């Protein structure tokens, strides 16, 4: 459950948030495969409540109606086709498994669902699964409101309704089998693994009991005996009874400390400086690298009120965001997930965005196609951070430098830092308000290297800055604080 099951030399996955299945499948073939991406995290593929107040919010997809693969992203045929086409070009599919809960208890009974299945939250009846009142935690939850009130009670966090979402009884073999039936259906279709949504709200033993029911991966695309990649969403910044290490036996865990700390450091908040990133990794109190799923932002916290609050960097802070992602992709700690978002009319009142519920770009609730501009950016309000040259090239950087040790660190005691990855790559950062002009040991073979942040290596020449490494491995770097991207990254495959 720790191995991503990616192809050799593909070290990152991208969260194609609210993307349609056919758009993802085409994206696998036209972009993700040639650009070296390892896999894709898909929005929950199972039927959810259609919520019209507010109008089709993104978070409606975390309120399951049933386990039918039938959503605003596509039907089972489109999903099967996406998984097949992606695997055939070497890009994996990881399913956001919403297994902790059904929809909210106060949702109106009826057929207002993405596949028209009937469901009655009031009576705990989901006949499309089927689930009944026996399959929920009404009895086990000891709290007055039936919801999660006190996060310092680990039992209530697990046994009660997350923001009123009906909490399944994962101790029962019947509930474990229906979830495993659903997950095994996705494994048989060919998915490489799962993001376990709201893992903090499930007991680790219940997770283990479910995972033990899972098949090995589809042998058409995976070696015999391959297990599904498991990364569990557990928000743990410390100081709470639930520790993300409690889930190490089931798979990797989302390290929400990663993006929280990295954002504060790069915003230069709270006296933090980039020079403190020298011991980045376990040194900062993070989970072991082999247990870590890392990211700058996720679909939730990029709206400002998730784990890490205002410190989370997003595409809205594009310049600072690119630096954080570049550092993450350059540093060997953890398995990196790149965020790919859509635009929404962010409207702040008292520092709170009242439109952070807005779902993907749509035409009367129908998600818009992802269109590609001639400059390779996206239209139809899709941000496609994964297609940004500065981020995409760093995804490749991580592939090129895979396995090479963190070495050759430099810092100025402030915010001008650099490091290398063995003899395969070097990266330099200037987050101070003055120029970075210095000659640094890169550890790279002598040659002319294309800076993959400001440009590309195309036809034996660079479209951006050129770095000249001498025979001693030294190279001079000159980065203005007014530079569009105040960081430079070179690697073995950007050498002319």
């Amino acid at each position: 459950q720790y191995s991503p099951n990616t192809q050799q030399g593909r070290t990152s996955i991208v969260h194609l948030f609210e993307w349609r299945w056919v758009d993802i499948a085409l994206e696998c073939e036209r972009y993700l495969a040639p650009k070296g991406f390892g896999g894709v995290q898909v929005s929950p593929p199972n039927e959810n409540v259609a919520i019209y107040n507010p109008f089709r919010p993104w978070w409606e997809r975390y309120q399951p109606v049933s386990y039918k693969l039938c959503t605003r992203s596509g039907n089972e045929d489109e999903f099967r086709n996406m998984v097949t086409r992606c695997n055939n070009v070497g890009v994996r599919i990881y399913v956001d498994a919403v297994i902790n809960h059904m929809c909210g208890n106060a949702v109106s009974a009826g057929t207002s669902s993405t596949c028209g299945s009937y469901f009655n939250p009031g009576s705990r009846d989901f006949p499309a699964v089927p689930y009944s009142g026996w399959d929920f935690n009404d009895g086990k939850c000891k709290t007055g409101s039936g919801d999660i009130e006190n996060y310092n009670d680990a039992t209530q966090v697990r046994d009660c309704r997350l923001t009123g979402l009906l909490d399944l009884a994962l101790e029962k073999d019947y509930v474990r089998s229906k979830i495993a039936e659903y997950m095994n259906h996705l494994i048989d279709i060919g998915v490489a693994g799962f993001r376990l949504d709201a893992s903090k709200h499930m007991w680790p033993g219940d997770i283990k009991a479910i995972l033990d029911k899972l098949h090995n991966l589809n042998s058409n695309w995976f070696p015999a005996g391959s297990k599904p990649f498991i990364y569990q969403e557990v928000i743990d910044l410390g100081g709470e009874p639930i520790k993300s290490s409690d889930y190490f036996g089931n798979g990797r865990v989302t390290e929400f400390k990663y993006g929280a700390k990295l954002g504060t450091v790069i915003r230069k908040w709270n006296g933090e400086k980039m020079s403190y990133l020298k011991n980045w990794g376990e040194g900062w109190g993070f989970v072991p690298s082999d247990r870590a799923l890392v990211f700058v932002d996720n679909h939730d916290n990029q709206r400002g009120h998730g784990a890490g609050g205002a410190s989370i960097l997003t595409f809205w802070d594009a310049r600072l965001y690119k630096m954080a992602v570049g550092f993450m992709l350059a540093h060997p700690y953890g398995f990196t997930r790149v965020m790919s978002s859509y635009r929404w009319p962010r409207q702040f009142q008292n520092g709170n965005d009242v439109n952070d519920w807005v779902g993907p770009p749509n035409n009367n609730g129908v998600i818009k196609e992802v269109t590609i501009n001639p400059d390779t950016t996206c239209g139809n309000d899709w941000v496609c951070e994964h297609r940004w040259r500065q981020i995409r090239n760093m995804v490749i950087f991580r592939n090129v430098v895979d396995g090479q040790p963190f070495t050759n660190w430099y810092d100025n005691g402030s915010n001008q830092v650099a490091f290398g990855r063995g003899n395969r790559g070097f990266i330099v950062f200037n987050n101070d308000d003055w120029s970075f002009s210095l000659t640094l040991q890169t550890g790279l073979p002598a040659g002319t290297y294309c800076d993959v942040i400001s440009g590309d290596k195309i036809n034996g020449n660079c479209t951006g800055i050129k770095i000249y490494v001498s025979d001693d491995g030294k190279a001079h770097f000159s980065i203005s604080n007014s530079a569009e991207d105040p960081f430079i990254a070179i690697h073995a495959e950007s050498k002319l």
Partner: peptide
């Protein structure tokens, strides 16, 4: 319930707190 552990964004939380 409070404002400590917000999930699904601010707008969802405000409607949940009500």
């Amino acid at each position: 319930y409070g404002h400590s552990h917000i999930r699904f964004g601010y707008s969802y939380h405000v409607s949940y707190c009500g």
